């Protein structure tokens, strides 16, 4: 069987080396229609004699029936690791990519099939096509229409992406993302969407290029398939949107995407809820154009319940607590969003997350959220009767006695007593825990924003009579008097307003 070509092989090599571009064309066809034999393709393989001659004849031809059979051999040889090694050694890779510069898809399919098999098999072939300029062509090859073609070209761009930060920018340089997301908002085929998603997912793991797909509409197109029945896909369409969320904060025309996300917060896979609660956190950090869209679709309802699903788990807790904070500061439906937390029974599950086993970053967002919630004074009465002002004042000491920075809490944990002191009974509860020496201690901090919220909870506290008969001791009727000269002005204002309500 195979003992035939094992000696007839060197014959066909010589006739390939000939000059006449007809005694080499149809001669190479003889090699192909023999490669259809798993017994004798082994013989073409085992001896890498013409393995160069096939490669060499490919990039030195002008007839199309040549390349139809020429590269087809290279395909029909990728079926075993034995052959792959020969194709790399024979310099085929910086030549197989030249066939990507053809319109005849019969050549292109046979070509990109080999390049796919090499990457997901042949070691040491990544550095190859990276340098044969194929990163350009593979992108520019995303004009064709044969679903399975673009489903392979996108995958060959995945391996050539997960690795070097430099291989991506070629994709960022020539159409790339704007031609990529086109494959996501025009094609029904499922496998191609998943293959394309891993590309867009990999491209989104460095802030250097994240603001490129977003301007290309990547958030919009990726929002189309969030509901797609292929669950093995949506988990890629989500991790991408979580990384991208640092760019669409200042982007418009993206509304309905949120509406499909706020719904997913009550789904089966706890994975999706986690990434979904994160997608809404960074899509809200400083932008009251998305916020109002989240509220009028029941965002607060969807989040309090989601905060209540887990509780002890913190992968869910942070991006939802840190979300509700964004939906409770500087926007139109502010007061309503501060109300809606209470009506939907939020106050408990919020103050509960102050207590352990919760760790520091969640406690940051929670403390900031309680400052936010206290703006509608209806929220004061429960927080007082919820066991909150204590665990605030202790957390402050936990972050104080040793002075993310604990000082970032000392500010927010005091600045939440300032929006809490605007209620009458809470000023007694603060006064009751015998804390006035600590707020006075804070003023001496020569930092900055800590100066403000310190005097803030004192300025609110001193409106009553007995605070003058208390803060005037301990050592305040002088350090504030040597603070009015502060460069910061809201810091000076507060540092003075205390000094007033003390004389009479
Ligand atoms: O608790 S944070 O959200 N930390 C934190 C940690 C990692 C990332 C970010 C972040 C990334 C992108 C966009 C907004 N945020 C914030 C925070 C908030 C305010 C201040 Br002042 C300091 C830290």
Numbering used by the authors: 145 to 547, 564 to 664
What sentences appear in the manuscript?
pmcWingless/integrase-1 (Wnt)/β-catenin signaling, a pathway that regulates tissue homeostasis, evades its tight control in many human diseases. In physiological conditions and in the absence of Wnt ligands, the pathway is kept inactive by means of the β-catenin destruction complex. Activation of Wnt/β-catenin involves the binding to TCF and additional co-transcription factors. In cancer cells, β-catenin promotes transcription of the oncogenes, Axin-2, c-Myc, and Cyclin-D1, ultimately promoting the growth of several types of cancers, including colon cancer, hepatocellular carcinoma, pancreatic cancer, lung cancer, and ovarian cancer.
With the aim to elucidate the binding mode of 9 within the β-catenin Armadillo repeats domain, the crystal structure of the complex has been determined at 3.4 Å resolution from apo-protein crystals soaked with the ligand. The ligand, which can be easily accommodated into the final 2Fo-Fc electron density map, occupies a solvent-exposed cavity resulting from the curvature of the α-solenoid superhelix involving the Armadillo repeats 7 to 10. The cationic side chain of Lys508 strongly interacts with the ligand through electrostatic interactions with one of its sulfonamide oxygens and with the cation-π attractive force of the bromophenyl aromatic ring. In addition, the heterocycle ring of 9 forms van der Waals contacts with the side chain of Asp390 and Cys429. Three structural water molecules actively contribute to coordinating the binding. In particular, a water molecule mediates H-bonds between the second sulfonamide oxygen with the sulfhydryl-reactive group of Cys466 and NH of Arg469. A second water molecule bridges the side chains of His470 and Cys429 with the nitrogen heterocycle ring of 9. Indeed, these two positively charged residues are typically involved in salt-bridge hydrogen bonds with Glu17 and Asp16, respectively, playing a key role in Tcf-4 functional binding and the transcriptional activity of Wnt downstream genes. The crystallographic analysis of the β-catenin Armadillo repeats domain revealed that compound 9 and Tcf-4 share a common binding site within the hotspot binding region close to Lys508.
